[PDB]
């Protein structure tokens, strides 16, 4: 959450993607946000913060 | 060979996003997806970038054909695009978008095209 | 399929289509030679209410249900030949019709298409039969027939139909299809799960919900553009739009500790009124979208529970069921009441048929044997403001088991000190 | 589910065309003392609480 | 069936609780002192008296009193946090 007022527009679009998308569907974002998309939006990413391969 | 960072810089080596950006920066895939409807938002047809502190005019961003916008959040912080499914007749997805988007350039043009042999 | 012998002289249907449920009344006047009524199949597993009056009384004749299926009306005293009687009948379905241009756009009127039969269906000889159709402001008929005698004629924001002097005993082979104009989200929950904790040491009752709601309206043609919605918010003159932005449930009288959580966190855009509770989703629901959330609050026991008169260990509880948004239609809703520990149950009743009933147990905080008594029971197809009712449970709760909670904690502490006593005074030296 | 299904666990929701094998790529010990505290509060002391509240209040 | 219960519901009187809800945070801190005194003196006498019978006697009695005040302490101390 990013604070004279609130800015909560970073959890709208993970819960959109949890409610309104079919359950086997791949998301392709840059590797900084890999853990949050898998944890909070619950889909199957292509990269994450491990930088293994 | 395919990608080189000598091309995203302007003349005499400055990185910027303005109306004098590069020719291969304006045609990239992460430029078109960020500044899509950003000049049509503000009044008069001009906009401030608020971070880079540069000014954008609605002729500087071309339209994309192969993707389409599905959800865009409140303060324009996360934007979600979707791959458009392939064309059911073999046509390239740039040509159908150019056919729909530009109903001008009518002509007769009776000339035989230059094709290869049907094998 | 057994019929009987009767005869009616009037028949006045008037379908009202003004909410997310289609509500009609008929006024019949049946004369001489217990009374049956007939339903088209497919509109029998959507019926959600049934009733019968006398034309001037304030009573309610009893009635129930059970390929044309039937329903039964009784009579309070008797029936006599060469005698007429007039009655009305109300009914509430669970159908709305489908949006006829499927992909509307953003800010347009939406139209609905609904189809039924034109002539009456009842198994008896009809003398005169009218048909009226009140509700929306713009009606039209879809695929009209060629015969002039059964078209409809409009006046005063309603339709009218022909008086139609002779109708045979049993014939329903003629249809219609109306397109009307509607402006509302017209949402429905898919299932609900409400549960009621009924603590007794401290007084309070507390309620929890779990709404899984969706929207049945017309989808968007081209995507979802944000700035066009900003242009709608900038210049506002109407509430005629078909997506939902706020919604408000009505609460009991003095409610204390509200919260509006979610499945991903805790949404913080919600403020109370004297009796209402206005909530807002994270994103506006546009007609094929879903939203799953959770509301809860708390009250006082001293107006939901009455101790019996000639005793001190018999209690009677009466719980409201289904207090929610003002216009919504619930498909299946299941209730669950958690009585306090070590109670026994005598009888349970409700004014609405209750498909199943079950009694189990469930453990909770500082609960060290056998759990709370949970009793759960289910419903199906019931609407907001027409099926509210109460539910009555009678139970007993002795003074013996009222004092067993601190003795259970105290017996675990007492059996925890003796282990330190035995462990502390015991020889473990290896030298002499 | 069980502790036997966690030591050798192949998840196919990360690095998608070639999923990662977790049991030889992470350090157990932060998870298993937490499942131990959950198993002790739920069965012995008598009070059931959620796994999210055990995970938030694990450092203080 | 419904009418006997429904006329038996309006024929009754309301519910009077045993201890009002705004009083219990006084009994909480008024219990937490006494149980710490009694239970502390219970575990204090486990030292070397070198007399087994009177040590088991005093320890058992003060453990009983400390237990029966710790129970009421945690029941009243749980209703004033918001978990009933
Ligand atoms: C990894 C840890 C697991 C240990 C399991 C056993 C736990 C024993 C805990 C002992 C508690 C302390 C009390 C103690 O001092 O006992 C030890 C105790 O001395 C010993 O260590 C002997 C214990 C083992 C007994 C041998 C049987 C084999 C055990 C099964 C494998 C003996 O030392 P002391 O006899 O006290 O030393 C001399 C006496 N002074 C007065 C000088 C102190
Ligand atoms: C001097 C020598 C001292 C030796 C000290 C040994 C202390 C270890 C005591 C551990 C007690 C475990 C008790 C237990 O069974 O709790 C379980 C399982 O709980 C766990 O997941 C954590 C236990 C994992 C054990 C780790 C291997 C043993 C490491 C110490 C030898 C709860 O986990 P659950 O995830 O709920 O399910 C586990 C699988 N079941 C079969 C049980 C369904
Ligand atoms: C001498 C006293 C003995 C010990 C006192 C016992 C403390 C009581 C708390 C027990 C654990 C409660 C954990 C908890 O989840 O509480 C939170 C609400 O969260 C809270 O408010 C808990 C705050 C507790 C503060 C604890 C202070 C430190 C105590 C350590 C000794 C409520 O969440 P829910 O369980 O979701 O409540 C609604 C669900 N109902 C079933 C009740 C309808
Ligand atoms: C080992 C030492 C560990 C110490 C840890 C210290 C932690 C400090 C931070 C604690 C967090 C505060 C918890 C908390 O939220 O308590 C508040 C307000 O609660 C109260 O009203 C105070 C009641 C205190 C009762 C005394 C209990 C003593 C026993 C505890 C071990 C709850 O009150 P409210 O939020 O107002 O809930 C309203 C419920 N009513 C029934 C009153 C309407
Ligand atoms: C949020 O609420 C919805 C609405 O109830 C929940 O959806 C439920 O589960 C599935 C989707 O997970 C819905 O579709 C079903 O999918 C299965 C696939 O196995 C298919 O076989 C079924 O025929 C059906 O199409 C289902 O309709 C729906 N309702 C139920 C089961 O009653 C969803 O689970 C909720 N929670 C989220 C998104 O976290």
- HEC-encoded secondary structure of chain C: CCCCCCEEEEEEEEEECCCCCCEEEEEEEEECCCEEEEECCCCCCCCCEECCCCCCCCCCCCEEECCCEEEEECCCCCCCCCCCEEEEEEEECCCCCEECCCECCCCCCEEEEECCECCCCCCCCECCCEEEEECCCCEEECCCCCCHHHCCEEECCEEECCCCCCECCCCCCCECCEEEEECCCCEEEEEEEEEEECCCCCCCCEEECCEEEEECCCECCCCCCHHHHHHHHHCCCCCCCCCECCEEEECCCCCCCCEEECCCCECCCEEECCCEEEECCCCCECCCCEEEEEEEEECCHHHCEEECCCCCCEEEEEEECCCCCCCCEEEEEEEEEEECCCCEEEEEECCCCCCCEEEEEECCCCCCCCCEEEEEEECCCEECCCCCCEEEEEEECCHHHHCCHHHHHHHHHHHHHHHHHHHHCCCCCCCC
Residue with tokens 């027939």: C145
Experimental method: cryo-EM
Residue with tokens 């071309």: B62
- Residue in chain C lying closest to A20 (CA): C289
Domain count along chain E = 1
The first and second tokens of residue E39, run together, are 């239970």
**Would strands C187-197 and C329-339 be described as parallel, antiparallel, or unpaired?**
parallel
Sign of the four-CA dihedral C280, C286, C292, C298: positive
The first and second tokens of residue C51, run together, are 């009733």
Kindly give the number of the ligand 1 atom that is closest to the alpha carbon of C430. Answer: 35
3-state secondary structure of B101: helix
Q: Smallest Cα–Cα separation from C338: which of C364, C301, C365, C373?
A: C373
- Distances, alpha carbon C269 to alpha carbons C126, C233, C259, in Å: 58, 18, 10
The first and second tokens of residue E77, run together, are 């101390």
Question: Residues of A annotated in the binding site for dolichyl diphosphooligosaccharide, as ranges?
Answer: 35
Ligand 3 and E82: CB distance under 6 A: yes
Strand partners, C98: C113
Q: Which residues contact residue C146 at a Cβ distance below 8 angstroms, ignoring those fewer than 6 apart?
A: none
Task: Please give the backbone phi and psi of residue B16, each rounded to the nearest 5 degrees, phi first.
Answer: -155, 165
The first and second tokens of residue D24, run together, are 């030889």
Q: Whose CA is nearest to atom 2 of ligand 5?
A: C212
User: What is the 8-class DSSP label of residue A33?
Assistant: G
Chains C and B touch (3+ CB pairs under 8 A): yes
Q: Which residues contact residue C72 at a Cβ distance below 8 angstroms, ignoring those fewer than 6 apart?
A: C35, C36, C63, C64, C65
The alpha carbon of D31 is separated from its chain's Cα centroid by a whole number of angstroms, namely 4
Q: Among all ligands shown, which has an atom nearest to the Cα of E70?
A: 3
- Residue in chain C lying closest to D46 (CA): C366
**Would strands C7-16 and C130-134 be described as parallel, antiparallel, or unpaired?**
parallel
3-state secondary structure of A13: helix
H or E segment to which residue B70 belongs:
strand B67-72
Residue in C265, C268, C291 closest to A19 by CB: C291
> Hey, is the C-beta of D60 within 8 angstroms of any chain C C-beta?
no
- D15 Ramachandran zone, left/alpha/beta (phi>0; psi -120 to 50): left
Q: Smallest Cα–Cα separation from C260: which of C240, C280, C246, C274?
A: C280
3-state secondary structure of B19: coil
Q: Smallest Cα–Cα separation from A1: which of D60, B75, B70?
A: B75
Do the Cβ atoms of C330 and C322 come closer than 8 Å? yes
User: C120-135 in b/e burial notation, b at 16+ Cβ within 10 A?
Assistant: bebbbebeebbbebeb
Distance CA D40, CA C370 (A): 19
Distance CA C216, CA C20 (A): 10
**Would strands A26-27 and A44-45 be described as parallel, antiparallel, or unpaired?**
parallel
Which residue out of A15, A19, A20 has the highest number of ligand 5 atoms within 8 Å of its CB and is therefore the one to mutate? A19
Cα dihedral value B22, B27, B31, B32, nearest 10: 140
Strand partners, B55: B48
Task: Please give the backbone phi and psi of residue C296, each rounded to the nearest 5 degrees, phi first.
Answer: -155, 160
- Residue in chain C lying closest to A7 (CA): C268
The first and second tokens of residue C10, run together, are 């009037």
Interface list for chain B against chain A, based on CB atoms closer than 8 Å: 71, 73-75, 77-78, 80
CA-only gyration radius of chain A, Å: 13
The first and second tokens of residue C325, run together, are 């948004």
Residue in D14, D18, D25 closest to A38 by CB: D14
Question: What is the 3 state secondary structure string of chain E?
Answer: CHHHHHHHHHCCECCCCCCCCCCHHHHHHHHHHHHHHHHHHHHHCCCCCCCHHHHHHHHHHHHHHHHHHHHHHHHHHHCCCCCC
- Give contacts of E70 with chain C, Cβ < 8 Å: 409-410, 413
D48 to C368: CB separation less than 8 angstroms, yes or no: no
Angle at D23 between CA D21 and CA D29, to 5 degrees: 145
Kindly give the number of the ligand 5 atom that is closest to the alpha carbon of A42. Answer: 39
Residue in E6, E70, E79 closest to C392 by CB: E6
- Resolution to 1 decimal, in Å? 3.5
Distance CA C157, CA C134 (A): 7
Distance CA C253, CA C273 (A): 12
H or E segment to which residue B67 belongs:
strand B67-72
Cα dihedral value E45, E48, E53, E54, nearest 10: -40
Which residue out of C187, C193, C212 has the highest number of ligand 5 atoms within 8 Å of its CB and is therefore the one to mutate? C212
CA-only gyration radius of chain C, Å: 29
Do the Cβ atoms of C110 and C218 come closer than 8 Å? yes
3-state secondary structure of B99: helix
Q: Smallest Cα–Cα separation from C417: which of E72, E50, D40, E35?
A: E35
Strand partners, C313: none
- Distances, alpha carbon C30 to alpha carbons A33, C34, C125, C368, D17, in Å: 73, 12, 10, 64, 74
**Would strands C158-160 and C206-208 be described as parallel, antiparallel, or unpaired?**
unpaired
Question: Number of CB pairs < 8 Å for A and D?
Answer: 24
Distance CA C422, CA C78 (A): 83
Angle at C299 between CA C297 and CA C302, to 5 degrees: 165
User: What is the 8-class DSSP label of residue B62?
Assistant: P
Distance CA C190, CA C213 (A): 6
Q: Which residues contact residue C105 at a Cβ distance below 8 angstroms, ignoring those fewer than 6 apart?
A: C220, C221, C222
H or E segment to which residue D37 belongs:
helix D32-43
The first and second tokens of residue E84, run together, are 């009933």
Task: Please give the backbone phi and psi of residue C336, each rounded to the nearest 5 degrees, phi first.
Answer: -155, 120
- Rounded to the nearest angstrom, the minimum Cα separation between D45 and chain A is 31
**Which 165-224 residues of chain C touch chain E by CB within 8 A?**
197, 199, 201-204, 206
Q: Smallest Cα–Cα separation from C176: which of C294, C281, C97?
A: C97
Q: Whose CA is nearest to atom 1 of ligand 5?
A: C292
Q: Among all ligands shown, which has an atom nearest to the Cα of E75?
A: 3
Q: Among all ligands shown, which has an atom nearest to the Cα of C430?
A: 1
Q: Whose CA is nearest to atom 41 of ligand 2?
A: D2
Do the Cβ atoms of B39 and B46 come closer than 8 Å? yes
Cα dihedral value B69, B75, B77, B81, nearest 10: 0
Task: Please give the backbone phi and psi of residue B35, each rounded to the nearest 5 degrees, phi first.
Answer: -105, 45
> Hey, is the C-beta of A46 within 8 angstroms of any chain D C-beta?
yes
Distance CA B60, CA B62 (A): 7
- The 10 Å Cβ neighbour count of residue A36 is 16
- HSE, CB side, 13 Å, CA atoms: give it for residue C287: 21
> Which domain, by its residues, includes E22?
1-84
Distance CA C278, CA C276 (A): 6
Residue with tokens 């759990």: C371
Distance CA C426, CA D11 (A): 51
Q: Which residues contact residue B68 at a Cβ distance below 8 angstroms, ignoring those fewer than 6 apart?
A: B81, B82, B84, C223
Chains in contact with E, counting 3 or more C-beta pairs less than 8 Å apart as contact: C
- HSE, CB side, 13 Å, CA atoms: give it for residue E64: 5
Angle at C416 between CA C412 and CA C418, to 5 degrees: 125
Distance CA E59, CA E44 (A): 9
Task: Please give the backbone phi and psi of residue A36, each rounded to the nearest 5 degrees, phi first.
Answer: -75, -35
Q: Which residues contact residue B50 at a Cβ distance below 8 angstroms, ignoring those fewer than 6 apart?
A: none
Q: Smallest Cα–Cα separation from C384: which of C183, C252, C249?
A: C249
Q: Among all ligands shown, which has an atom nearest to the Cα of C289?
A: 5
E12 to C307: CB separation less than 8 angstroms, yes or no: yes
Distance CA E46, CA C400 (A): 35
- Give contacts of A53 with chain D, Cβ < 8 Å: 15, 18
Strand partners, C29: C86
- Rounded to the nearest angstrom, the minimum Cα separation between E15 and chain C is 5
- Distances, alpha carbon D51 to alpha carbons C430, D31, D36, D58, E83, in Å: 45, 11, 11, 11, 18
Distance CA C271, CA C276 (A): 9
- Distances, alpha carbon C82 to alpha carbons A11, C169, E62, in Å: 73, 20, 91
């Amino acid at each position: 959450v990013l604070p004279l007022a609130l800015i909560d527009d970073f959890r709208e679009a993970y819960y959109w993607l949890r409610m309104n998308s079919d359950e086997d569907s791949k998301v392709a974002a840059w590797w900084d946000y890999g853990y949050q998309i898998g944890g909070m939006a619950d889909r199957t990413t292509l990269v994450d913060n491990n930088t293994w391969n | 060979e395919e990608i080189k960072e000598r091309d995203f810089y302007t003349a005499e080596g400055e990185y910027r996003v303005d109306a004098r950006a590069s020719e291969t920066m304006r045609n990239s895939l992460l430029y078109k997806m960020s500044y899509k409807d950003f000049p049509q938002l503000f009044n008069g047809g001009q906009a401030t970038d608020r971070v880079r502190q540069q000014m954008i005019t609605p002729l500087d961003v071309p339209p994309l054909d192969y993707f389409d916008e599905v959800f865009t959040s409140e303060n324009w912080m996360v934007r979600i695009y979707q791959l458009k499914k392939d064309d059911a007749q073999g046509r390239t997805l740039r040509d159908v978008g150019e056919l729909t988007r530009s109903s001008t350039k009518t002509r007769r043009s009776i000339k035989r095209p230059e094709l290869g042999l049907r094998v | 399929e057994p019929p009987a012998t009767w005869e009616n002289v009037d028949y006045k249907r008037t379908i009202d289509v003004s909410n997310a449920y289609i509500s009609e009344t008929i006024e019949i006047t049946i004369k001489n030679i217990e009374y049956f009524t007939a339903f088209e199949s497919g509109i029998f597993s959507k019926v959600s209410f049934f009733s019968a009056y006398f034309t001037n009384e304030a009573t309610f004749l009893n009635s129930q249900l059970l390929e044309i299926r039937y329903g039964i009306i009784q009579f309070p005293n008797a029936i006599s030949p060469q005698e007429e009687v007039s009655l009305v009948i109300k009914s509430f379905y669970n159908t709305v019709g489908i949006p006829y241009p499927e992909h509307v756009g953003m800010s347009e009127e939406q139209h609905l298409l609904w189809e039924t039969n034109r002539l009456p269906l009842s198994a008896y000889d009809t003398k005169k039969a009218s048909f009226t159709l009140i509700g929306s402001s713009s009606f039209e008929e879809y695929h009209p027939p060629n015969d002039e005698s059964l078209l409809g004629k409009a006046n005063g924001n309603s339709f009218e139909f022909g008086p139609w002097e002779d109708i045979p005993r049993f014939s329903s082979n003629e249809t219609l299809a109306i397109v009307y104009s509607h402006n509302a989200p017209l949402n429905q929950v898919v299932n609900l799960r409400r549960d009621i904790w009924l603590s007794h040491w401290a007084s309070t009752i507390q309620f929890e919900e779990y709404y899984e709601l969706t929207n049945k309206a017309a989808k968007l043609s081209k995507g979802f553009s944000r700035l066009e919605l900003m242009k709608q918010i900038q210049t506002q003159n109407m509430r005629q739009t078909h997506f939902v932005t706020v919604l408000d449930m009505l609460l009991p009288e003095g409610a204390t500790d509200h919260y509006f959580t979610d499945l991903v966190g805790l949404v913080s855009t919600s403020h109370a009124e004297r009796d209402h509770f206005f909530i807002r989703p994270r994103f506006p629901i546009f007609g094929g979208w879903n939203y799953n959330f959770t509301v809860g609050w708390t009250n006082k026991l001293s107006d939901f529970l009455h101790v019996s008169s000639g005793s001190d260990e018999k209690f009677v509880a009466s719980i409201p069921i289904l207090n929610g948004p003002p216009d919504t239609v619930y498909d299946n809703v299941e209730l669950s009441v958690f009585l306090p520990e070590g109670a026994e149950i005598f009888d349970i009743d409700s004014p609405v048929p209750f498909t199943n009933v079950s009694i189990e147990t469930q453990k909770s905080y500082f609960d060290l044997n056998k759990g709370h008594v949970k009793l759960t029971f289910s419903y199906r197809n019931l609407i907001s403001q027409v099926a509210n009712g109460q539910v009555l449970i009678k139970y007993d709760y002795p003074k013996s088991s009222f004092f067993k909670k601190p003795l259970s904690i105290a017996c675990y502490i007492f059996t925890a000190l003796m282990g330190v006593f035995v462990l502390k005074t015991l020889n473990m030296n290896v030298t002499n | 589910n069980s502790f036997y299904k966690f030591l050798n666990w192949f998840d196919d929701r990360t690095w998608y065309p070639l999923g990662r094998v977790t049991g030889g790529t992470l350090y157990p010990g932060l998870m298993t003392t937490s499942a131990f505290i959950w198993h002790a509060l739920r069965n012995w002391l008598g009070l059931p609480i959620d796994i999210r509240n055990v995970c938030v209040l694990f450092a203080p | 069936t419904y009418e006997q219960l429904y006329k038996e519901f309006h024929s009754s009187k309301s519910f009077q609780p045993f201890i009002h809800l705004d009083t219990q945070p006084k009994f909480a801190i008024c219990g937490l002192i006494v149980t710490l005194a009694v239970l502390s003196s219970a575990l204090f006498a486990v030292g070397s008296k070198s007399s087994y019978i009177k040590k088991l006697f005093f320890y058992t009695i003060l453990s009983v009193i400390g237990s029966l005040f710790a129970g009421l302490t945690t029941v009243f101390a749980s209703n004033s946090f918001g978990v009933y």
